[PDB]
Amino acid sequence: SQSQGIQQLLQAEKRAAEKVADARKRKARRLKQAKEEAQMEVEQYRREREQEFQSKQ
Amino acid sequence: VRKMKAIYHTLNLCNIDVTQKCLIAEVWCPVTDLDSIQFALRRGTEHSGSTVPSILNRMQTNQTPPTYNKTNKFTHGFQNIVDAYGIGTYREINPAPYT
Structure with missing residues:
Protein backbone atom coordinates (compact mmCIF):
# COMPACT_ATOMS: atom_id res chain seq x y z
CA SER A 1 0.00 0.00 0.00
CA GLN A 2 3.03 2.27 -0.20
CA SER A 3 2.04 3.42 -3.67
CA GLN A 4 -1.30 4.54 -2.25
CA GLY A 5 0.33 6.38 0.62
CA ILE A 6 2.57 8.11 -1.90
CA GLN A 7 -0.33 9.10 -4.13
CA GLN A 8 -2.24 10.44 -1.12
CA LEU A 9 0.81 12.50 -0.22
CA LEU A 10 0.94 13.73 -3.81
CA GLN A 11 -2.68 14.82 -3.46
CA ALA A 12 -1.80 16.61 -0.22
CA GLU A 13 1.06 18.40 -1.95
CA LYS A 14 -1.22 19.42 -4.80
CA ARG A 15 -3.64 20.90 -2.29
CA ALA A 16 -0.78 22.73 -0.57
CA ALA A 17 0.26 24.15 -3.95
CA GLU A 18 -3.28 25.33 -4.59
CA LYS A 19 -3.66 26.85 -1.14
CA VAL A 20 -0.55 28.95 -1.56
CA ALA A 21 -1.32 30.05 -5.11
CA ASP A 22 -4.75 31.05 -3.81
CA ALA A 23 -3.10 33.01 -1.02
CA ARG A 24 -1.09 34.90 -3.62
CA LYS A 25 -4.28 35.62 -5.54
CA ARG A 26 -5.87 36.99 -2.39
CA LYS A 27 -2.76 39.08 -1.77
CA ALA A 28 -3.28 40.69 -5.18
CA ARG A 29 -6.96 41.25 -4.46
CA ARG A 30 -6.19 42.80 -1.10
CA LEU A 31 -3.65 45.16 -2.68
CA LYS A 32 -6.20 46.41 -5.21
CA GLN A 33 -8.70 46.85 -2.39
CA ALA A 34 -6.09 48.82 -0.47
CA LYS A 35 -5.72 51.22 -3.38
CA GLU A 36 -9.47 51.70 -3.77
CA GLU A 37 -9.95 52.32 -0.07
CA ALA A 38 -7.00 54.68 -0.10
CA GLN A 39 -8.67 56.82 -2.69
CA MET A 40 -11.91 56.76 -0.70
CA GLU A 41 -9.95 57.95 2.31
CA VAL A 42 -8.31 60.72 0.30
CA GLU A 43 -11.70 62.00 -0.78
CA GLN A 44 -12.83 62.04 2.85
CA TYR A 45 -9.62 63.75 3.99
CA ARG A 46 -10.18 66.44 1.37
CA ARG A 47 -13.75 66.81 2.62
CA GLU A 48 -12.54 67.37 6.17
CA ARG A 49 -9.92 69.85 5.07
CA GLU A 50 -12.45 71.67 2.91
CA GLN A 51 -14.86 71.99 5.83
CA GLU A 52 -12.10 73.32 8.04
CA PHE A 53 -11.05 75.76 5.33
CA GLN A 54 -14.53 77.17 4.98
CA SER A 55 -14.93 77.46 8.75
CA LYS A 56 -11.64 79.28 9.02
CA GLN A 57 -12.62 81.49 6.09
CA VAL B 1 34.59 11.51 9.40
CA ARG B 2 34.91 8.29 7.51
CA LYS B 3 31.62 7.31 9.05
CA MET B 4 30.17 10.66 8.06
CA LYS B 5 31.16 10.00 4.49
CA ALA B 6 29.67 6.54 4.70
CA ILE B 7 26.42 8.06 5.82
CA TYR B 8 26.32 10.59 3.07
CA HIS B 9 27.11 7.89 0.56
CA THR B 10 24.19 5.85 1.80
CA LEU B 11 22.00 8.93 1.75
CA ASN B 12 22.83 9.40 -1.90
CA LEU B 13 21.52 5.87 -2.54
CA CYS B 14 17.89 6.91 -2.23
CA ASN B 15 14.99 8.59 -4.00
CA ILE B 16 14.10 12.18 -3.13
CA ASP B 17 10.40 12.89 -2.72
CA VAL B 18 8.67 15.79 -4.43
CA THR B 19 5.72 16.22 -2.06
CA GLN B 20 7.86 16.75 1.06
CA LYS B 21 11.59 17.05 1.49
CA CYS B 22 11.60 13.38 2.39
CA LEU B 23 13.44 10.37 1.06
CA ILE B 24 12.12 6.87 0.48
CA ALA B 25 14.57 3.98 0.69
CA GLU B 26 14.24 0.24 0.23
CA VAL B 27 16.05 -2.36 2.31
CA TRP B 28 16.06 -6.13 2.22
CA CYS B 29 15.90 -7.46 5.73
CA PRO B 30 14.50 -10.52 7.51
CA VAL B 31 11.67 -10.07 9.97
CA THR B 32 14.04 -10.52 12.93
CA ASP B 33 16.02 -7.64 11.66
CA LEU B 34 12.93 -5.68 10.65
CA ASP B 35 11.69 -5.73 14.26
CA SER B 36 15.09 -4.73 15.51
CA ILE B 37 15.19 -1.99 12.91
CA GLN B 38 11.81 -0.62 13.86
CA PHE B 39 13.17 -0.25 17.37
CA ALA B 40 16.37 1.18 15.96
CA LEU B 41 14.31 3.61 13.92
CA ARG B 42 12.59 4.85 17.01
CA MET B 59 6.41 -5.08 0.38
CA GLN B 60 4.31 -8.22 -0.39
CA THR B 61 6.14 -8.56 -3.76
CA ASN B 62 9.45 -10.49 -3.38
CA GLN B 63 12.57 -9.44 -5.38
CA THR B 64 15.48 -11.94 -5.89
CA PRO B 65 17.48 -11.10 -2.65
CA PRO B 66 21.14 -11.51 -1.74
CA THR B 67 22.07 -14.58 0.25
CA TYR B 68 22.55 -13.83 3.94
CA ASN B 69 24.33 -16.50 5.97
CA LYS B 70 24.91 -15.85 9.66
CA THR B 71 28.36 -16.99 10.71
CA ASN B 72 30.52 -16.79 13.80
CA LYS B 73 34.20 -16.76 14.74
CA PHE B 74 34.52 -20.47 13.91
CA THR B 75 32.04 -21.10 11.11
CA HIS B 76 32.90 -17.96 9.12
CA GLY B 77 35.97 -19.60 7.63
CA PHE B 78 33.95 -22.57 6.43
CA GLN B 79 31.32 -20.35 4.85
CA ASN B 80 34.06 -18.50 2.98
CA ILE B 81 35.49 -21.61 1.36
CA VAL B 82 31.93 -22.37 0.28
CA ASP B 83 31.41 -18.84 -1.04
CA ALA B 84 34.72 -19.08 -2.87
CA TYR B 85 32.97 -21.52 -5.20
CA GLY B 86 29.83 -19.40 -5.41
CA ILE B 87 26.99 -17.63 -3.65
CA GLY B 88 24.16 -20.05 -3.08
CA THR B 89 20.64 -19.66 -4.37
CA TYR B 90 18.23 -17.83 -2.08
CA ARG B 91 16.70 -20.37 0.31
CA GLU B 92 19.15 -22.97 -0.97
CA ILE B 93 20.39 -25.61 1.42
CA ASN B 94 23.54 -24.19 2.94
CA PRO B 95 26.34 -26.76 2.58
CA ALA B 96 28.53 -25.08 5.21
CA PRO B 97 27.02 -26.75 8.32
CA TYR B 98 27.98 -30.06 6.72
CA THR B 99 31.35 -28.83 5.49
Whole structure:
Protein backbone atom coordinates (compact mmCIF):
# COMPACT_ATOMS: atom_id res chain seq x y z
CA SER A 1 0.00 0.00 0.00
CA GLN A 2 3.03 2.27 -0.20
CA SER A 3 2.04 3.42 -3.67
CA GLN A 4 -1.30 4.54 -2.25
CA GLY A 5 0.33 6.38 0.62
CA ILE A 6 2.57 8.11 -1.90
CA GLN A 7 -0.33 9.10 -4.13
CA GLN A 8 -2.24 10.44 -1.12
CA LEU A 9 0.81 12.50 -0.22
CA LEU A 10 0.94 13.73 -3.81
CA GLN A 11 -2.68 14.82 -3.46
CA ALA A 12 -1.80 16.61 -0.22
CA GLU A 13 1.06 18.40 -1.95
CA LYS A 14 -1.22 19.42 -4.80
CA ARG A 15 -3.64 20.90 -2.29
CA ALA A 16 -0.78 22.73 -0.57
CA ALA A 17 0.26 24.15 -3.95
CA GLU A 18 -3.28 25.33 -4.59
CA LYS A 19 -3.66 26.85 -1.14
CA VAL A 20 -0.55 28.95 -1.56
CA ALA A 21 -1.32 30.05 -5.11
CA ASP A 22 -4.75 31.05 -3.81
CA ALA A 23 -3.10 33.01 -1.02
CA ARG A 24 -1.09 34.90 -3.62
CA LYS A 25 -4.28 35.62 -5.54
CA ARG A 26 -5.87 36.99 -2.39
CA LYS A 27 -2.76 39.08 -1.77
CA ALA A 28 -3.28 40.69 -5.18
CA ARG A 29 -6.96 41.25 -4.46
CA ARG A 30 -6.19 42.80 -1.10
CA LEU A 31 -3.65 45.16 -2.68
CA LYS A 32 -6.20 46.41 -5.21
CA GLN A 33 -8.70 46.85 -2.39
CA ALA A 34 -6.09 48.82 -0.47
CA LYS A 35 -5.72 51.22 -3.38
CA GLU A 36 -9.47 51.70 -3.77
CA GLU A 37 -9.95 52.32 -0.07
CA ALA A 38 -7.00 54.68 -0.10
CA GLN A 39 -8.67 56.82 -2.69
CA MET A 40 -11.91 56.76 -0.70
CA GLU A 41 -9.95 57.95 2.31
CA VAL A 42 -8.31 60.72 0.30
CA GLU A 43 -11.70 62.00 -0.78
CA GLN A 44 -12.83 62.04 2.85
CA TYR A 45 -9.62 63.75 3.99
CA ARG A 46 -10.18 66.44 1.37
CA ARG A 47 -13.75 66.81 2.62
CA GLU A 48 -12.54 67.37 6.17
CA ARG A 49 -9.92 69.85 5.07
CA GLU A 50 -12.45 71.67 2.91
CA GLN A 51 -14.86 71.99 5.83
CA GLU A 52 -12.10 73.32 8.04
CA PHE A 53 -11.05 75.76 5.33
CA GLN A 54 -14.53 77.17 4.98
CA SER A 55 -14.93 77.46 8.75
CA LYS A 56 -11.64 79.28 9.02
CA GLN A 57 -12.62 81.49 6.09
CA VAL B 1 34.59 11.51 9.40
CA ARG B 2 34.91 8.29 7.51
CA LYS B 3 31.62 7.31 9.05
CA MET B 4 30.17 10.66 8.06
CA LYS B 5 31.16 10.00 4.49
CA ALA B 6 29.67 6.54 4.70
CA ILE B 7 26.42 8.06 5.82
CA TYR B 8 26.32 10.59 3.07
CA HIS B 9 27.11 7.89 0.56
CA THR B 10 24.19 5.85 1.80
CA LEU B 11 22.00 8.93 1.75
CA ASN B 12 22.83 9.40 -1.90
CA LEU B 13 21.52 5.87 -2.54
CA CYS B 14 17.89 6.91 -2.23
CA ASN B 15 14.99 8.59 -4.00
CA ILE B 16 14.10 12.18 -3.13
CA ASP B 17 10.40 12.89 -2.72
CA VAL B 18 8.67 15.79 -4.43
CA THR B 19 5.72 16.22 -2.06
CA GLN B 20 7.86 16.75 1.06
CA LYS B 21 11.59 17.05 1.49
CA CYS B 22 11.60 13.38 2.39
CA LEU B 23 13.44 10.37 1.06
CA ILE B 24 12.12 6.87 0.48
CA ALA B 25 14.57 3.98 0.69
CA GLU B 26 14.24 0.24 0.23
CA VAL B 27 16.05 -2.36 2.31
CA TRP B 28 16.06 -6.13 2.22
CA CYS B 29 15.90 -7.46 5.73
CA PRO B 30 14.50 -10.52 7.51
CA VAL B 31 11.67 -10.07 9.97
CA THR B 32 14.04 -10.52 12.93
CA ASP B 33 16.02 -7.64 11.66
CA LEU B 34 12.93 -5.68 10.65
CA ASP B 35 11.69 -5.73 14.26
CA SER B 36 15.09 -4.73 15.51
CA ILE B 37 15.19 -1.99 12.91
CA GLN B 38 11.81 -0.62 13.86
CA PHE B 39 13.17 -0.25 17.37
CA ALA B 40 16.37 1.18 15.96
CA LEU B 41 14.31 3.61 13.92
CA ARG B 42 12.59 4.85 17.01
CA ARG B 43 15.99 5.35 18.62
CA GLY B 44 17.31 7.16 15.56
CA THR B 45 14.36 9.45 15.11
CA GLU B 46 14.52 10.20 18.80
CA HIS B 47 18.08 11.36 18.45
CA SER B 48 16.97 13.69 15.65
CA GLY B 49 15.09 16.66 16.98
CA SER B 50 12.09 16.08 14.67
CA THR B 51 11.16 12.55 15.88
CA VAL B 52 9.58 11.82 12.51
CA PRO B 53 7.53 8.57 12.63
CA SER B 54 9.48 7.29 9.58
CA ILE B 55 7.04 4.69 8.27
CA LEU B 56 8.53 1.49 6.83
CA ASN B 57 5.99 -0.32 4.63
CA ARG B 58 6.45 -4.05 4.06
CA MET B 59 6.41 -5.08 0.38
CA GLN B 60 4.31 -8.22 -0.39
CA THR B 61 6.14 -8.56 -3.76
CA ASN B 62 9.45 -10.49 -3.38
CA GLN B 63 12.57 -9.44 -5.38
CA THR B 64 15.48 -11.94 -5.89
CA PRO B 65 17.48 -11.10 -2.65
CA PRO B 66 21.14 -11.51 -1.74
CA THR B 67 22.07 -14.58 0.25
CA TYR B 68 22.55 -13.83 3.94
CA ASN B 69 24.33 -16.50 5.97
CA LYS B 70 24.91 -15.85 9.66
CA THR B 71 28.36 -16.99 10.71
CA ASN B 72 30.52 -16.79 13.80
CA LYS B 73 34.20 -16.76 14.74
CA PHE B 74 34.52 -20.47 13.91
CA THR B 75 32.04 -21.10 11.11
CA HIS B 76 32.90 -17.96 9.12
CA GLY B 77 35.97 -19.60 7.63
CA PHE B 78 33.95 -22.57 6.43
CA GLN B 79 31.32 -20.35 4.85
CA ASN B 80 34.06 -18.50 2.98
CA ILE B 81 35.49 -21.61 1.36
CA VAL B 82 31.93 -22.37 0.28
CA ASP B 83 31.41 -18.84 -1.04
CA ALA B 84 34.72 -19.08 -2.87
CA TYR B 85 32.97 -21.52 -5.20
CA GLY B 86 29.83 -19.40 -5.41
CA ILE B 87 26.99 -17.63 -3.65
CA GLY B 88 24.16 -20.05 -3.08
CA THR B 89 20.64 -19.66 -4.37
CA TYR B 90 18.23 -17.83 -2.08
CA ARG B 91 16.70 -20.37 0.31
CA GLU B 92 19.15 -22.97 -0.97
CA ILE B 93 20.39 -25.61 1.42
CA ASN B 94 23.54 -24.19 2.94
CA PRO B 95 26.34 -26.76 2.58
CA ALA B 96 28.53 -25.08 5.21
CA PRO B 97 27.02 -26.75 8.32
CA TYR B 98 27.98 -30.06 6.72
CA THR B 99 31.35 -28.83 5.49
